[PDB]
Each structure stands twice: as C-alpha cells, then as structure tokens.
Amino acid sequence: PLRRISIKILVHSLFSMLIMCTILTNCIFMTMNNPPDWTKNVEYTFTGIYTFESLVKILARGFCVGEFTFLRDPWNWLDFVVIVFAYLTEFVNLGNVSALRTFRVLRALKTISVIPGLKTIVGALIQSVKKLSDVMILTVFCLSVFALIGLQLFMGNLKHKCFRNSLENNETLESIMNTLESEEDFRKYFYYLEGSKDALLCGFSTDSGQCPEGYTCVKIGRNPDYGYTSFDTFSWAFLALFRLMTQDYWENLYQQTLRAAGKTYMIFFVVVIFLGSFYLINLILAVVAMAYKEQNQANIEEAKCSPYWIKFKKCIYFIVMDPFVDLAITICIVLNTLFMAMEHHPMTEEFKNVLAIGNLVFTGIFAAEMVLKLIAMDPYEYFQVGWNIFDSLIVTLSLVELFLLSVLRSFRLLRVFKLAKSWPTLNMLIKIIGNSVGALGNLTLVLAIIVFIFAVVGMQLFGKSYKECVCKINDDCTLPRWHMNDFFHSFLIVFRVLCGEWIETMWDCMEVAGQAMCLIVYMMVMVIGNLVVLNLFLALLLSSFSGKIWWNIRKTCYKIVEHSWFESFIVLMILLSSGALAFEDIYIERKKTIKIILEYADKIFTYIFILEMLLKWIAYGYKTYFTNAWCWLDFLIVDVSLVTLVANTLGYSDLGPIKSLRTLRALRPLRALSRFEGMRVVVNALIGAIPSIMNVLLVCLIFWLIFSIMGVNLFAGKFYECINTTDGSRFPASQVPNRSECFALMNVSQNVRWKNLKVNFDNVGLGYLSLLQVATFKGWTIIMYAAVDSVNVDKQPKYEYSLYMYIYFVVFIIFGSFFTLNLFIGVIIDNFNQQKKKLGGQDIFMTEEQKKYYNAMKKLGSKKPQKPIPRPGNKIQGCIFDLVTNQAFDISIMVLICLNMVTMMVEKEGQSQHMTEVLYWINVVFIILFTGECVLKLISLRHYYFTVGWNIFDFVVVIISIVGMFLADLIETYFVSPTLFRVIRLARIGRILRLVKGAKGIRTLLFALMMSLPALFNIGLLLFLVMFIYAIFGMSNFAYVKKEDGINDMFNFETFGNSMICLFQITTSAGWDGLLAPILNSKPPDCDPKKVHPGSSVEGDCGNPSVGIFYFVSYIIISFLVVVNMYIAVILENFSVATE
C-alpha cells in the first residue's frame, strides 16, 4: 500500500518539476559569499527537500531489498553523497569547512539529472573524450621532449640580473644576498627597469644583453614572475612549455628568454610554436571534430461604425504593397542606422540637436507604419508573424522614451537585421544563433551549468584567501582587478580562462592560495571547460553546414624568354635584388662602403628588369602581355623603380612623392611570387576564396557596427582621466573630480595631464578598432578597465563605478567573436571544399611534382610482411638471434628507454657534484646497454638488420650518443665555450625518440604530420615572403618611433634581424596591440616631432597613425587567412590517415 503511494508519488509530472525548482533556487543561495545568519534556516529546508525526494525513490525502488533498484543507476550515487554530506556536517566534521563545504556545489550537478535530456548530452560529451586517448599520449610526449630540450638549453638563464660593480664597505655578492629581502632594498642593488615588478634580465652574449654601464651581469635570485616563470626544473619547464602550446601570454616567455639567452635562440621558439602549438592544437580539433561526426551521423542514420471599418480595412491591406511599400521601408531602416553612426565626444551644440530632430522623424515613421500596418490586416492577423512581434517591441520602446536606463534607447539599431530575409549570408548568421538555443539548446545549457559550478567552486575555495592575502598579490593592499572574492568576479575569471588567458590570473591565485590547489582547479577548468566549448563550436558549425623580317625576330625573342637559362637567370636576380633591401636601416651610415655598392647595384638591376620586360613585349605582344594578371604586377613594379631612377638622375628629388615613392620599393620581393611553382599554387587558392570571404566580411561589418554604435553611446568621451605623468597613476577623484578641476591643478602643478586612451569609443571608426582588440583578446583588458571605471563625459573616472558594463564586453565576445568566427571558419573551409571538388578531387596545396612525392609517402602506410630472416646455422649465432627475435626481449628494451627518460628529468638547477656525478655514471651504463643491444641484433641479423628503417634510426642514435659523450669530454679537456657543449648534449634526446617505435597509436598521428609537410611547406614559403615584404616596409617606416610599450631595445624595427623577430611574434597576433601603440602617438606631448637622432639625417619620432593602423591591421588579417590554411591542410591529411 505504502509502496504504491510512494511509487505513485515517484512518477508524477509535478514531482520532477518540484525537485527541479528547489534546486535552481538553491543555486542562487550559493552565490551569497557571506550569507546572513537567517539564511541558515533556508539551508535546512533544501536539505529537507532532498531527503524527502531521495527517501521516496529509495523506499519504492528498494522494497527493503537492499535498494537494488535505487543504487543500480550511476546518477543516484551522486544523490546519496549529497544527502550524507549535508547530514555528515551536522555530525562531527572535518576541520576545513570551506574545503568540505565546496561539496555542496555538488547539488548543482543534480540539476543535470532533473532536466530532461541533459543526461544524454553529458554522456555524449564523455564519449568524445575516449577518442582523445591517442592525442593525449602524443601531447604529453611532445610537451615532454620539448621540456627536456628547453631544460638543457635554458636552465638557469632566467636568473641573470645586473649586479652593480662597486660595493661599499667590502660587501660581496654573496654577503649582500642573504641579508636583504625587500623590493626597496633590492632595487638599490640590482637594476630594475623603472617600476617593473622584477629586475631586468641581462645577457652574456653580444646578441642579447645589455646592462647599463656601471652594472655587471651575474646570475642570482628568483626567476621572474614570482619564480613561477623559470626553466630550472622539469616540472617548471613543463609548465612553461604548456603555456607556449596553448599560447597564453607566450610572447613574454619568448621575449624574456631571448633577452637572457640572446636572439639566436629565437629558432627554438619558431620550431616549438610552429610544430608544437599550431600542429598539436590542430590535431585535437580534428579528432574532436572527427569523433563528433561519427556519433552525430551514426545516431541520425538510425532514425532514417462596423461597416466603415471593412471598407477602410480592405484598403489598408492593399497598402501592404510588398513590391514597393515594404521594400521602401528597408531603405529607410538602412538610412536610419547610418544616421545613428554619427557621434563623437566633441559635438557642436547645433549638430547635437539636429541628431535629436532626425531621430524623432525616424521614430515616428516606424510607428506610423506599425499603427498603419495594424489597420490593414487586423490585430490578430498582425501579430501572427514573428518578425512583426519583433518589430513591435522596438517601436513600443521608442514611444515610451519620450515621457517615462537611457541605454535601452540606443537599442533601436537592431532593427537593422530586418535585411536578413533578403540577404543569403545574413540569413545564415541568424540561423547559427538560433541553433545554439534551438536544437543545440541542451548542449549550450551544459556550458552554462559548468561555468556556474566553477565560478562558485572557485569562490568557495579561494574567496577568503584573496581578501586576507591581498598584499602578496598587490603592492597597494587592495583587491586586484581580477580576483575570486565575489560571484560576479569569480565568474569573470572563469570566463577569461575559456579564452586562453589562464596564466596571468594563476600566478595571483598561487601567491594567495598555494600551488597545489590553484593548479588543480585552473587545469580542470581549462581542460574540461574548453572541451565543452570546443564541442559546441564544432557541433554548431557542422550542424549549421549540413619581307616580314619582323616575324622572325618575334619568334626568336620568344625563344629566349622560354629558355631555361634565362628563366633561371631572372630568378637569381630577383632573390639578389630582394636581398639588397635588407641592408638598409639605421646602421647603414656605418659601413659607408656597402652603401655605395648597393646604390650602384640597384641601377644594374633596374636596367636588367627593364630589359627583360622589353623582351616580354616582343615575345608575347601587347594583347597577350596585358591580359595576364602576373605581368601587370610585374609591369607595375618596374615602373615605380623606373620613375625613381629617372627622377633621381635628374635631381629635383626628395620633394615628398617622388620621395614617398622610394618607400614603395619594399614591393620588389613581390615579383618572386610568379616564379616559384609552390608559392603560386597557394596564391591561386586564396584568390578563389576572396569573393566568398567578401560576403562573410560584409555580415561581420554590419554586425559589428551595431556593437560599435552601441558602444559609442555608452562610453564616448568618457575615457579621459587626470594622471600623474611620472608614474601614470590616476588621481583619487577625492580631489580633481572633473576635467575643470584637473586643469586648475596643472596651473599650480608641473606634471599632471588630462588624457585620452588612444584606442577608444570616441567615434564609430575608433570603436571598430576597440572592438577588434577585444575580439582578438589582445589589449582588451586595458579598455575594459576604462569602461567600468567611467562615470560621465567631463568627470574623472571613479574606480569600478559601472562594474556591470563588463557585461557588454561579455556579450560582444560571445556574439562578436564566438559566433562570427564560427561563421568565418565555416565559410572558408567549405569554400576550400568546393575548390577541391572542381579540380578533379585533387589536393590544391601542392605543385605537380609534389604530388608524385606525396603518393610515394602513401606507400609507406602498407603493412605487407617483410621477409622473416633465417637464423644463421651456428647455434651460438642462432641463440642470440633466437633471443633477439623474441618480442619479450624488445619489451625489455622499451622499458629500459623509459627508465633512461626518467633520468633526464631528475636534472635540475644547482644540483651539486655528488648528484651530478651519479647522473653522469648512470648515463654511461645506458649508453653501454643500448650500444650492446645494437651489436646483438647485428650479430644475429647480419645484412637483414639494415633492411628495416627503424633499425637504421636506432643504429644512428647510438653513433650520435657515443660521439656526444666523447666530444663533450674532449670539449671539457680543451675547454673554452660552454654553449657549444649544451648543444652537443642535445644528442642524448635522440634515444627518447625511439619510444615512438613502440606505440602504434602515436605513430599514426605522426605519420599524418609527415604527410602534410609538402603542403605546409608551400604555405610556409608564401608566409615567409609576406613577412619579408612587411619587414622591409617596417624598417623604413617605423624605425625612429619613440620606444614605449612593446618597442624597446631588441624587438624594435631598427634593423632587419629585429624586424623579423617582431613579425614572427605578431603572426599569432600576440602583442600586436603593444607594438601598434607607440606608432599611434603624434604631436606634443605624446612625442617630439623634431628630434636630433645623432648619427642620422632624419628628424622626429612620430608614428603615422593612419599608416600604422593600416599596416598592423592588414598584417593581422593576412596572417590569419594563411593560418586558416594550416588548419585546413592538417584536417584533410588527418582524416585520410585515420580513415585508412
């Protein structure tokens, strides 16, 4: 009877709803962070509902039969844990309430069980993770190898600091270190670069450096970043490398090591970033995406007065006028948005009013049509259509504005979408947004639930610590901008980590909360959180997606152009011509002799190219010559060079253009594109996709405009602040509250300045730039601080007054970056798919010769058995062969290599001699055993041993290993030069590589990387040329800019070596915001227009704001386009290898 009642209670429509409603309410309570005492009673009730809900299920299912029905399901295990925990706490409990309390967050997980269909989504997510097993192994191995290389090459390097040369009272470097521990005390002693947290990193070599005179370089003390950033230990090196792989603030690690290590080591980073980061991340996407398709597709496959009104009313319907009246309105809407686009911080009084008058007319017209619209079809008919309801809400808002949060008013701009119905692509963007809250609504909901659990979990665990510690983290003694103290704040940190910004925040948590706790939480958010985000992106994207002597002469010239020596000769000139470009720069004044030959050398080049062009005309004729795209490019370049030469000989030079014209030379490397077969193929693919890219860009521009317009209304003119010029610190606002007040201070004070941000929302054009930084996550935080801080147009900003304006940025990122990028990626890859289909289903990234080679590599995939080999007749020879052949013996060798690998890991900075000696000796035994194995295989195998490819790699490794040990030893006896020695040891890492032979899963992935090398090479060549043209433009244009942020000695545009280093850094668009900033400032007091620049003719160090913006922005976009290509090339090959 009771069981029937309970069972009756268990399955009911209301009960599932009741259990769920309480749970959502419970979540609001977790967010309290210091709930009042009275709330405690409420806490009891939640405990009561769960037991009751929990008790009935257990009572009915069990039948006092051990709760067999109840505990059989996995989810129920979770409920039992929660009930005991609430109950356990009342009972004697463990000491850490916060650690113990954190469990309560588990109730939130219950929500997953209650909501219908959520259980299915979570299961779907777990299935995807299983596919990722091989990639995980390779990633750990890859990160591990680089960590070993990084540790050997850079250990102890981050330690360098400039220690002053003269010390009073017979003090010693050693004596000084133990006695003092204070930033103020430390500053007197080591250099410290004007307010940086830590001492300047110095270098031994000529390339790195440098310390000011009177300061010498010695290595002592903690690594920069609280000691967190160091290459000293394997664990620390591993963290540093993991950061590089995910590219989080990777630029600083790169800048820091290069400075201490020297620029020559830039090579290490290029290989790691290029192979380790671009490639590894791509592999993860392919596997997740590939895995998603099987499950998505596999599941899908299984399924398959009164009379007057009528006269008047009939007339209104005729008035719908779809051919013209409906169409006419859209023109009106487009015009209206354009009207709204005009705004600025400084607006004249007459202009400000005109905008107001103009808005009313538009507001009236939209309403009249709506009121007018209603009469023609009747109200019920009128509200039937969804767009109508959508249009209606906007019109109503405007009417209320006149009499009855003015921001909502800024909101009428959405109206702009209406055009979506007409536009094919816009319709697609509308479709994508719908899918997230539509079919994929359950999946999107999970992301929301997970973000919520983490924000609360982080808050419970580290909330108290941030407040008490504050000081370890902040000099001031106040909370930092990013912290985990409150739910909104805790939430912001979690959201930041979804974008790859985890490292900066983590150092802060670690100082206050300790290393073990902070590391575990952040690592989980990053891995678990990102997997869900990745799934949503991929899931969303895929679902959405689905005499006449003259004639003889003419013939002959044709013969000359066609001939190989000539084609070959011309190419040499192009490389040579391009190379001469690199020499020019700030150091050209020195080495006057090279300058003279180069100037003369160009003239010979100009003559050769002009001469070559004439041959082209005779051989091809004008019609053939000008119908070619390449020739026009080629013809145009000779002309610019030709004009400068004629103008130059004549004199009458340096008067702007032609002088501006000289800078146009950087275009010379451009003719190289036509000559190389590999480079041309890649370019053809891009041209194929520009029209398609153009369509997406239009949608992005229209979409971004609404955000930009919205942004302008909210923050236009509010970013100004009064700052102390010496340290750039905003005044309190207790004093100097408004701009008017700030000026009075200047009149009686020397260094106070009232100044704008430089990248802001003052006008619509600027807003677009501000948005671009937020979209890329570079330089975004400086802007956000400004937005929240802001109060009014002529008033000094208070600290965190707005606080909720953060929401604006969060919404833009989700819509502006997550959705559009989803759209950008979807169209580009698809367009690439169509191109492949057109050219007979053949890869479009390789030259014809490359294709033959690609096929040969395909052959290596086959497993046909090779000959077994015959044991030699001799038993002595045979047993060894017999022993060697056995698989068990091979497993032993695999174990031995792993043992060897662990030995390398134990090495650490400042280990000591006894420790150092043992490692050296253990290493020797390893070399002997490995050499021993090689000899044994050889005795039994004989000629057969050389047949296998792997055996040869194994044999080669042994030769390198013995030589590496001996050479290091000879080097030690000979001495002189430590650096050659570290590189020499790098040979041991070779043995670790043999591990790949053992693992079948990792090898398949590795084979895929090898297959795509030909395609990647062509893109790499094209990418290199573009980087080269930009470096040249940069050297002439940006050398001499004042050094501010991101531009300092090294990592500057002063010379070609330097320019290349920067361009590589920005290829990933990291720190692009920093380099651009010095270029932006123009006029006093930002910079001095005329500066002496000893040793050179040029005057002033002012960036060209217009030229600078085009240059950085164009580069960011172009590099991104090519990188999309790497993503495309890797995916194609990966599907093929896995597919086999």
Partner: protein
Amino acid sequence: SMEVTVPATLNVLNGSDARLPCTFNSCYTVNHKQFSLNWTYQECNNCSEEMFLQFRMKIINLKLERFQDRVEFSGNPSKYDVSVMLRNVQPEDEGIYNCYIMNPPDRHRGHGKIHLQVLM
C-alpha cells in the same frame, strides 16, 4: 583579520606552572622588525590593563612587580606562536590575560583573551 587561538578559560593549580597558549594565524611570513606582540594582565574584567611582556625586535619582559620574575616567553612567533609561561602560579595571578598581535603587512590586529583561574 588575524587568527587567534587561545583557551577562553585556563584552570591551573596553585604552585604549578601555567602555560598560556594562544595561536595567531595570518598570511605572509613574519618579519622581526615587522612582527610585534603584546601581553597584558588585568585583575578583573573592568580592571586597567598592565602590559607585562612585549615583542619589539626581541622579547622585552617588563618584570612587573606583581609577577616577580615568574613570567617567561614560551613561544616561537615565526610559528604563529606567542605563548607565555607563568611559573609557580599564585592566587593573585587569577585574572584576564590579553595577547595583541599586529603583523606587518597585515593591517588587522589579533586579540586573544584568556581567563586564568587558580585552583586551591
């Protein structure tokens, strides 16, 4: 807020040694110039406080006449420990013992209060 752990009531037999144990907990690492600890005694709840031991760079024992030479420091502050020892406790030692700890850079000042009762 500095974390302070002391027994609210400490009952000790006349003539025995009384360790007054208090725990102070705060983030950071203690600084000798920076760390300051003060101990005061009161005969009763409303009674004037008499400082009897301080830490300022080092331990300073004020040698109050009311304690003779029976007060000793009994704690390693670097351990968050600032306990004191009252040897050979006498009936007049009954009262309130206050520990005040101010630790730079921590702005907050910890306070522990022990009611010492002397048996018979």
